[PDB]
Ligand binder design. Structure first.
Ligand code: CHL
Ligand code: CLA
Ligand code: CLA
Ligand code: CLA
Ligand code: CLA
Ligand code: CLA
Ligand code: CLA
Ligand code: CLA
Ligand SMILES: CC1=C[C@H](O)CC(C)(C)[C@H]1/C=C/C(C)=C/C=C/C(C)=C/C=C/C=C(C)/C=C/C=C(C)/C=C/C1=C(C)C[C@H](O)CC1(C)C
Ligand SMILES: CC1=C[C@H](O)CC(C)(C)[C@H]1/C=C/C(C)=C/C=C/C(C)=C/C=C/C=C(C)/C=C/C=C(C)/C=C/C1=C(C)C[C@H](O)CC1(C)C
Lengths: 217, 165, 203, 192
């Protein structure tokens, strides 16, 4: 099957019927972190959450960052947006961080207890009316009900394709955000400015010339 | 600042010690030729001395009443006053590399106990298995907490004890 | 069967059932039949909006060069008055196209389920549903005598040609900075000194 | 069945036809389980009735010429009034009387098990003493309540955009329809 290295041997824990059918399996565990199946279940969940919040974050970087080079949406840089936003806001940042810690803690603890038991949040009485729509959809990490409003998860023949598009765009958005961080430290300009500088002179403006990434040259 | 310590860029005994070391090096320098190898060696020594004092004054170190850098070992006080790079980041760097070494040794022991000659692998090292475990040991904290949570990190009370236990 | 490149090996999932099936899929984008359904309908939609777009770019500029409220180029159509701001027109456009688009999508999901007028419950499209090819009031002038096939193939050929033409107008206008019929007039005035290679190397 | 929210779609199997407002609208499958659906029928009827009263109140406040629903609690941040006649209270006493009265009425309503339609002293004129036009009146009631809920959320979003009351913005839409809507606003569509 498909692998991250054609020719390397696939590890025995990623070549099982419980692992081959997950999403985006390419036999990539050179550190052997997923040998414990409970650990692989937990790491599947951590990967899905990092994928989804990395896509949402990198979209919040790029689409305001692309449209600010167009006409509308005078938006500051992402390493400057929190300061301008807290100058425009109504609350200090500590109060807003406390509110988001309570609001995220409730939701994350719901997801926590649904990881610990799959049939957990469907207790009758536990919720006013959201208790019957807070179960899973037989595959943990992929909930239904109020999550997924448009009903696209219902169709079974598209479903592995939807999963694999999600995991590829998510891993790619994780690389995008780590590149946003490193590009921010090495250059000091925005990522669209880095893309414009690589398009203006590709053979002279890259990470071999920034003087930071490999300083032995 | 912390504990009545002045910053080293503000301390006067720090500059006095810098000037005293440059004075000793130039008193050793002034008895040679201009472009000779002892002169080049002492000028490189003076260059490293000036660079070291500039780097210590740059990093925000705290000097005392004698002009020497003092370190702060309290997580919250150093994270508050910007001294986290002297104990806190070094202690987590050390715990990473020390647990690396310990986890690679533990995996080598458990790998060689399952053979017909565990002692013979302890005297004569299985180099490919040692290099495989050495490369795989970069995810040692994750594997350590996973072996902790499964109960396979510990041996039970099948251990060796004395007659009064 | 006509191929895009005679002698080449054609993909097995392309079988002449679609209008304009010439076997052209080198990137193998439509091996899934469900994706092929979505791509056939999207080809029809992009092609028909491209045909209306190329007509709406040609015909006002073709009439402005000869002997009417505005003779303005297509990319400067936003900076004109139109009795109202463009935002209100955007809102009206999005409401009415939300209606029409969601009704067409519900036809595509379940064929035979979006046919009759909901207000006037006797007006109705006939049972020859064919998602992408409605009929009825959408064919008022009594066409489809020549059966359906040749006109479908003419429709997809004019549509692919207009999609290429609109990709044209965007590219030519972004590079040369001018209007397309003036670009055609410069190519007809001296084609041997006005090529893409000439205008590229003129930079 | 009251109709179909989307023609061509299928009716959900958990919604019965002897129930008012059953257009088959449940995409999220929220009321699939019967106890949840019973609680949601209760909540839908109560939200609809409170929204009818609230929309009629905001319309009467602005049509009778005493500010709008947004200008009404402004005296307490700064003297109450009603029909242009002063009311001699403050927000602490008003909050006390309102909390006692709503606690008593709500508690008497919540003592009953699943009573959506009480009748009795709540129905003095005896309209639902026939059980044939009563279901039609329930359907009229749930449609008017849904329309009033949509109207009140429209009031809130409309004032958060424009800063004006509903009747004044209705007059602005009747005056300049192509220059006063949610798009000359500059908020509902963030471009242009
Ligand atoms: C889908 C096809 C479509 C295409 C190819 C264009 C292309 C264009 N329009 Mg646009 N539009 C299109 C749909 C629409 N436009 C408009 C209303 C306008 C206006 C009012 C204006 C444009 C303008 C433009 C230019 C945008 C350049 C820019 O820097 O924007 C960045 C700026 C913003 C996004 C603001 C470009 C010629 C501008 C123009 O013509 O200048 C030469 C302009 O002023 N358009 C409406 C009505 C809502 C559309 C309907 O879908
Ligand atoms: C931190 C986010 C994260 C997490 C939790 C995972 C988790 C997983 N990945 Mg994914 N992956 C990620 C990011 C992540 N990945 C990124 C960014 C890429 C693109 C490079 C990939 C590309 C990828 C491929 C091609 C494959 C996987 C696979 C897996 C699964 C098994 C591997 C394993 O057991 O290691 C668990 C991993 C972690 C716990 C990540 C943290 C590791 C350390 C602590 C940090 C590493 C730092 C790194 C070097 C960056 C420098 C800064 C597991 C569910 C395999 C699979 O079968 O999926 C179903 C597989 O074939 N991943
Ligand atoms: C997510 C993908 C991604 C993309 C498209 C870019 C693009 C760019 N980077 Mg960034 N960067 C990235 C991730 C990315 N980077 C990561 C993960 C790091 C940390 C290692 C950095 C750290 C970094 C520094 C320090 C600098 C750049 C610079 C640049 C620009 C010049 C090209 C270059 O030398 O790149 C460097 C390339 C890498 C570091 C390796 C890329 C990692 C990916 C995962 C490899 C796989 C790519 C894939 C096969 C094909 C590309 C995908 C694309 C089509 C979407 C270019 C706009 C330079 C700049 O700012 O120019 C003005 C520069 O100085 N990057
Ligand atoms: C090894 C033992 C040890 C000792 C003796 C100290 C001593 C101190 N800590 Mg430190 N600290 C330690 C380890 C230690 N720390 C560890 C392991 C952590 C990580 C959890 C911290 C994280 C930390 C933070 C975030 C802060 C301190 C602070 C302090 C100072 C005052 C604390 C106090 O009054 O509460 C009595 C002391 C204890 C109960 C000993 C344990 C300390 C706990 C872990 C934190 C106590 C913080 C305290 C409640 C906040 C006081 C606010 C201050 C403005 C009055 C004091 C010098 C505070 C400071 O910076 O003051 C200038 C402060 O804000 N520490
Ligand atoms: C964007 C609109 C669009 C869409 C949705 C399609 C879709 C299709 N085409 Mg058509 N085609 C198009 C434009 C489009 N085409 C244009 C403009 C031409 C003239 C060059 C053609 C010429 C053509 C021929 C000769 C044939 C097809 C065929 C097909 C079918 C199978 C091929 C496939 O799987 O690719 C799916 C296509 C996409 C997913 C679109 C990719 C868009 C890329 C990413 C844009 C890249 C930029 C671009 C190069 C500029 C599929 C229904 C075959 C068929 O059976 O006809 C019914 C066939 O024989 N196409
Ligand atoms: C010009 C290329 C072209 C061709 C050959 C076809 C052919 C067809 N269309 Mg299609 N159609 C087209 C463009 C075309 N259409 C465009 C641009 C749109 C978007 C408005 C549509 C939207 C559409 C709908 C909604 C329907 C059809 C249907 C049909 C089928 C029967 C109707 C007919 O014979 O009209 C033949 C077409 C012509 C003779 C073109 C006339 C040129 C006009 C007069 C020029 C307009 C003025 C110009 C802008 C200046 C036939 C396969 C129907 C169907 O399949 O029913 C079963 C159907 O319901 N088409
Ligand atoms: C105010 C709360 C409320 C509640 C509790 C209900 C409850 C119900 N509705 Mg009703 N509905 C409402 C308001 C409400 N509705 C409004 C305002 C409208 C007009 C838009 C409708 C239109 C409607 C139709 C056409 C139908 C129903 C039906 C139902 C029943 C089954 C659906 C279900 O199980 O979901 C449970 C419902 C909820 C859990 C509602 C809670 C609100 C969610 C959690 C958030 C919604 C936010 C909202 C989308 C924000 C809009 C902002 C805007 C800018 C987009 C259930 C009794 C079906 C029925 O059989 O009638 C009895 C049916 O066919 N509803
Ligand atoms: C209950 C039905 C209803 C009616 C009759 C109105 C009427 C009006 N709205 Mg309001 N509004 C409503 C609901 C309604 N709204 C809802 C649900 C929201 C939240 C999404 C808003 C948020 C809103 C904003 C932000 C603004 C208005 C404005 C206006 C005024 C200008 C026209 C316009 O642009 O509409 C707004 C258009 C929509 C909300 C989209 C249409 C979708 C509707 C709700 C579907 C139902 C309509 C139905 C099919 C036909 C009308 C039924 C009615 C006769 C009972 C006009 C008086 C503007 C204004 O103040 O002008 C000066 C303005 O800026 N509305
Ligand atoms: C797999 C494996 C396995 C084997 O065994 C081994 C190894 C190899 C080691 C491994 C690997 C690993 C890796 C690579 C990892 C990575 C990760 C990442 C990168 C993540 C990110 C991740 C990322 C993320 C989350 C992110 C997110 C983001 C966000 C939210 C953002 C936000 C924001 C915005 C909007 C803007 C503003 O202004 C600000 C802020 C606030 C800033
Ligand atoms: C159905 C369903 C189902 C599926 O499954 C899913 C989904 C879709 C999600 C869902 C939907 C939902 C929705 C839409 C909702 C909405 C709601 C609302 C709107 C409410 C309101 C509601 C509203 C309401 C009650 C309101 C009320 C009001 C009131 C009382 C008012 C009052 C007042 C007045 C007089 C005036 C003064 O001066 C002040 C005040 C005080 C202000």
């Amino acid at each position: 099957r498909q692998s991250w290295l054609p020719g390397s041997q696939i590890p025995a824990h990623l070549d099982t019927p419980a692992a081959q059918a997950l999403a985006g399996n390419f036999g990539f565990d050179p550190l052997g972190l997923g040998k414990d199946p409970v650990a692989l279940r937990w790491y599947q969940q951590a990967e899905l959450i990092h994928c989804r919040t990395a896509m949402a974050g990198v979209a919040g970087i790029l689409i305001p960052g692309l449209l600010t080079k167009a006409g509308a949406l005078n938006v500051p840089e992402w390493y400057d947006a929190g300061k301008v936003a807290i100058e425009n806001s109504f609350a200090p940042w500590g109060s807003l961080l406390a509110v988001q810690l309570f609001l995220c803690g409730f939701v994350e603890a719901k997801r926590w207890q649904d990881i610990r038991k799959p049939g957990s949040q469907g207790e009758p009485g536990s919720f006013l009316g959201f208790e019957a729509s807070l179960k899973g959809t037989s595959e943990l990490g992929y909930p239904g009900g109020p999550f997924d409003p448009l009903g696209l998860s219902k169709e079974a023949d598209k479903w592995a394709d939807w999963k694999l598009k999600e995991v590829k765009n998510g891993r790619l958005a994780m690389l995008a955000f780590l590149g946003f961080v490193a590009q921010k430290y090495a250059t000091g300009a925005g990522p669209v400015d880095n893309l414009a500088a690589h398009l203006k002179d590709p053979w002279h403006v890259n990470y071999a010339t920034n003087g930071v990434s490999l300083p032995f040259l | 600042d912390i504990a009545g310590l002045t910053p080293c860029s503000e301390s006067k005994a720090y500059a006095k010690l810098e000037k005293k070391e440059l004075k000793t090096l130039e008193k050793r320098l002034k008895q040679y030729e201009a472009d000779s190898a002892p002169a080049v060696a002492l000028k490189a020594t003076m260059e490293r001395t000036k660079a070291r004092f500039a780097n210590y004054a740059k990093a925000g170190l705290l000097c005392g009443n004698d002009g020497l850098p003092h370190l702060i070992a309290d997580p919250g006080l150093a994270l508050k006053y910007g001294h986290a790079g002297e104990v806190f980041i070094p202690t987590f760097g050390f715990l990473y590399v020390a647990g690396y070494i310990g986890y690679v040794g533990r995996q080598y022991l458990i790998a060689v106990k399952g053979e017909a000659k565990p002692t013979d692998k302890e005297i004569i090292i299985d180099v490919p298995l040692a290099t495989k475990l050495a490369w795989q040991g970069a995810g040692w904290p994750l594997a350590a907490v996973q072996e902790l949570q499964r109960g396979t990190l510990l041996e039970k009370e099948e251990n060796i004890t004395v007659s009064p236990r | 069967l006509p191929s895009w490149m005679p002698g080449a090996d054609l993909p097995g999932y392309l079988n002449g059932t679609l209008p304009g099936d010439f076997g052209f899929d080198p990137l193998y984008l439509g091996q899934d039949p469900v994706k092929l359904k979505w791509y056939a309908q999207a080809e029809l939609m992009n092609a028909r909006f491209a045909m209306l777009a190329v007509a709406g770019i040609l015909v006002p500029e073709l009439l402005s060069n000869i002997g009417p409220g505005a003779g303005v180029a297509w990319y400067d159509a936003g900076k004109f008055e139109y009795f109202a701001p463009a935002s209100s027109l955007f809102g009206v456009q999005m409401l009415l196209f939300a209606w029409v688009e969601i009704r067409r999508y519900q036809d595509f999901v379940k064929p035979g389920s979006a046919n009759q007028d909901p207000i006037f419950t006797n007006n109705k499209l006939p049972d020859g549903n064919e998602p992408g090819y409605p009929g009825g009031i959408f064919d008022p002038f009594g066409w489809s005598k020549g059966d359906i096939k040749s006109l479908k193939l003419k429709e997809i050929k004019n549509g692919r040609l207009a999609m290429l033409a609109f990709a044209g107008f965007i590219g030519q206008a972004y590079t040369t900075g001018t209007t397309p019929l003036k670009n055609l007039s410069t190519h007809l005035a001296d084609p041997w000194s006005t090529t893409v290679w000439q205008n590229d190397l003129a930079r | 069945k009251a109709g179909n929210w989307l023609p061509g779609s299928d009716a959900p199997a958990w919604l019965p036809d002897d129930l008012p407002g059953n257009y088959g609208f449940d995409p999220l499958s929220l009321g699939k389980e019967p106890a949840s659906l019973k609680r949601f029928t209760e909540s839908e009827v109560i939200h609809g009735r409170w929204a009818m009263l609230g929309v009629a109140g905001s319309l009467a406040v602005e049509l009778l010429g005493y500010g709008n629903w947004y200008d009404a609690p402004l005296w307490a941040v700064n003297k109450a009034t009603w029909f242009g006649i002063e009311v001699p209270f403050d927000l602490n006493a008003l909050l006390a009387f309102e909390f006692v009265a709503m606690a008593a009425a709500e508690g008497q309503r919540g003592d009953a098990g699943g009573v959506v339609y009480p009748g009795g002293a709540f129905d003095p004129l005896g309209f639902a003493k026939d059980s044939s036009k009563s279901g039609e009146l329930k359907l009229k009631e749930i449609k008017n309540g849904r329309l009033a809920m949509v109207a009140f959320l429209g009031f809130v979003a409309q004032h958060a955009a424009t800063g004006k009351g509903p009747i004044a913005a209705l007059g602005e839409h009747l005056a300049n329809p192509w220059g006063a809507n949610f798009a000359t606003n500059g908020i509902s569509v963030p471009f242009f």
